[PDB]
Structures are given as C-alpha cells and as structure tokens.
C-alpha cells in the first residue's frame, strides 16, 4: 500500500468563500461558471416549450421532421454541431454586437419586468428566445411562402441585403453563412432544404391564415419604426418575415 493523502488541489474545493482579496477571485470564478451553466438551463427550458407547440396534442406535426430519405436525418445532426463550432469563432465585434442586438429585440418581446430582467443578465436565454418566438408562430424565412410574384420579388429584395451581412466590409465571405464543411456536404443540405420547403406548403387552412397575421405583427413591432415600413408589413407578410435579426449574419 502507498501513503496516499488527499492532494492540495483536491482539498481546496472544501473551502468556505471569503469576501475580499485573492479569496474573492476564487468565488468570483466559481459563481460565474455556476451562472453560465444555469444560463444554459434557461435556454434549454425555453426551447423545450417552444417545441411543445409543434406537438400540439401529442402527435408529431409536420413542422418537426428531419429529412425524408434514409440518411437524411443523421446528417442534419452533423451540420448543426458544426454550425455551433463556427458560432464561437467570431471576433469580439460580433459576439458583443449580437449580445446587444438580441437585447434590444428581447425587451420588445417581453411581457413583464421579470422576463425583461432575465434577458439582460443571461445572454443565451435571450438568444434562444428570439428564435423560440419565431418557431412557434412560424414567422421565419423557412416557413413563409410567397402568395404572389410581386411578393416573391419583395421578399427577395429584403433577403438580398441580409446576404451581405454574412459578408465582411471589404466584401469577402464570413464563416457565418456556410453550407458545407466536408466532401459533398453542401448537396445534402440542398436536399434537406428543398424537402422542408415542400412541407411549408402542406399546412392547414387556418395554419396558413394564422401565420399571415403573425408575420405582419412580427414585421411591425420588431423591424418597423415608421409608417411606410408598416405599409410593407401589413400588406406583404412574406417580406416582413425575411427581415431577420442582425445577430446571425445570414
């Protein structure tokens, strides 16, 4: 047998928090990790209640399919996990710029002072409530279908200037808008996006009519500040749903 005492690096977890000096530097680091993975529990719990609107009575709706072929659902996993790896490769002008862009939009969205307190403190809770407000009411750009041919040209003009914020200031591409990261991985997302465009036209009679009135509300209390922008949102709800936030550069 050895004489194996407990180490100095292992006995330090049993120490009581002190209040100033270097002993406040340990407790400031241990609380800011316990607030970071409490913020992850705040963002996970909101997404698990926005996903309970696509399971409205207990059966899986057409909104929450993955891909239609055999290996069309496993590769939807393998490019969401590399989409989150390139998310934390952005510089400090994009990480902090999206934190304040999300914080402006999350406080219009809030309904009480407790909700708008927590979007200020927890950044990932506010980032996963801008997206979770849009996946419920289907105010996205993967859910809106244009019901005209001037409406398709109006939404393509909004989506033309959203595709330049995924480019840099000199004009080259970012890593924010990336389809494929491996051999033939771009065409698997070409297959998976044409499939979810087909299911968007397969909605119900009232599901098309509720998201007409939801995309007009979304374009007129999140992206319109005048009266002429309200005229482009109250009559053409597909250009009012291509107005994305400026956090993600898509």
């Amino acid at each position: 047998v050895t004489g194996a005492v407990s180490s100095v690096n292992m006995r330090r977890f049993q120490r009581v928090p002190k209040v100033s000096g270097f002993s406040a530097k340990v407790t400031k680091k241990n609380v800011n990790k316990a607030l970071d993975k409490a913020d992850m529990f705040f963002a996970k719990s909101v997404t698990m209640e926005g996903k309970a609107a696509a399971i409205p009575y207990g059966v899986y709706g057409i909104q929450c399919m993955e891909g239609s072929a055999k290996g069309m659902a496993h590769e939807k996993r393998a490019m969401a996990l590399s989409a989150a790896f390139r998310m934390n490769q952005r510089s400090a002008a994009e990480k902090t710029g999206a934190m304040y862009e999300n914080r402006r939009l999350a406080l219009i969205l809030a309904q009480n002072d407790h909700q708008e307190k927590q979007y200020i403190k927890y950044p990932k809770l506010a980032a996963a409530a801008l997206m979770a407000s849009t996946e419920v009411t289907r105010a996205c750009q993967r859910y809106a279908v244009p019901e005209s041919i001037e409406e398709e040209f109006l939404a393509a003009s909004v989506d033309k200037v959203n595709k330049m914020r995924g480019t840099t200031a000199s004009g080259v591409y970012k890593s924010s808008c990336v389809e494929g990261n491996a051999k033939g991985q771009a065409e698997q997302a070409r297959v998976a996006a044409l499939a979810v465009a087909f299911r968007s036209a397969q909605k119900s009679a009232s599901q098309f009519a509720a998201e007409r009135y939801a995309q007009s509300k979304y374009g007129r209390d999140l992206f319109s500040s005048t009266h002429f922008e309200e005229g482009y949102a109250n009559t053409y709800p597909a250009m009012a749903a291509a107005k994305r936030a400026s956090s993600y550069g898509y």
């Binding site: 009575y57 207990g58 899986y60 993955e66 891909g67 055999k70 659902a73």
Partner: protein, 164 residues
C-alpha cells in the same frame, strides 16, 4: 387523435423512416387491451341516458347555489344546457375508449375549455363533481369487467385532471 397508431407512425415520419419492429410491437398491445375498452365502450353506449341523468343531479345536489337568480343554472332552459355537456363528455369518453387514446377528449372537449368556461362564468368544479360522481358510482363486477372498469375510470381521471 393520439392513438397508439398515430404516435408511432408520426414519430417515424419525423426521422423519415420505415415502420420498424418497435412500431409493430406497440400495436401488439392494441390486440391485448382492446377487449376491455371496447367492452366498456358498448356498456357506455347502451346506458348513457341513465348515467348522465344520475351524474347531473349529483352536481345540483351538491352545488345548489347555481339555482339562484343571477347565478349559472337560474332558468330551466340552461339547466337543460348543462346536462347537454355531461352527455357531451360521456360521448367523448366513449370515443376515446374506442380509439384507445386520449385524442377525442383532447382536441374536441378540452383544448379551449378554460377560455370558454371562464368567459361564460361557468364553474369548473361543478363539471368535476359530475365526472367524479360516476367514477365512484361504478362497481367493478356488476357494471362491467374488472379491466373494463380500470380503463373506464382512467379516462375519467384524465377529465378530472384537465379541469382541475
């Protein structure tokens, strides 16, 4: 319409998958449990005017404040509209006993009821005292089978919990 059928088929439609052996093994339980619930469905389908007459006057024996003026059940043409709904809820118990899943109670009798009963000032504890009268008026060898009365009172407990 959450069945055992529509649960495992729509979950297989989200992955884009063929029906596998986990899906067929769930439908084997539908050829095991259906003898009890279709017995309790046909017992309810041939006795329903006797049991919603017995349920609805247990509501007004307990909650006799409703027959006051200005209250809910104040004239005769809306006491008859009350037994209309106890007949409506027993009909939805009989539909979900047929399909073997809570779907007919869910999307035709529950999903919007709290918005309506509050707005029209209808006390939801009076609905509970009718549904929880027939759960313990039932005695298990006389009225149906042993497992027919297990699954009958279990679908009433879904109706008590979704109103309470």
């Amino acid at each position: 319409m959450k069945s055992v059928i529509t649960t495992v088929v729509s979950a297989a439609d989200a992955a884009g998958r063929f029906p596998s052996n986990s899906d067929l093994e769930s439908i084997q339980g539908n050829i095991q449990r259906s003898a009890a619930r279709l017995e309790a469905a046909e017992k309810l389908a041939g006795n329903h005017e006797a049991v919603v007459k017995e349920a609805g006057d247990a509501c007004f024996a307990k909650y006799a404040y409703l027959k006051n003026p200005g209250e809910a059940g104040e004239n005769q043409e809306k006491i008859n509209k009350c037994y209309r709904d106890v007949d409506h809820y027993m009909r939805l118990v009989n539909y979900c006993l047929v399909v073997g899943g809570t779907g007919p109670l869910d999307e035709w009798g529950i999903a919007g009821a709290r918005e309506v009963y509050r707005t029209l000032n209808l006390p939801t504890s009076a609905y509970v005292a009718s549904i929880a009268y027939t759960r313990d008026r039932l005695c298990v060898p006389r009225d149906m089978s042993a497992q027919a009365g297990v699954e009958f009172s279990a679908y009433l407990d879904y109706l008590i919990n979704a109103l309470s």
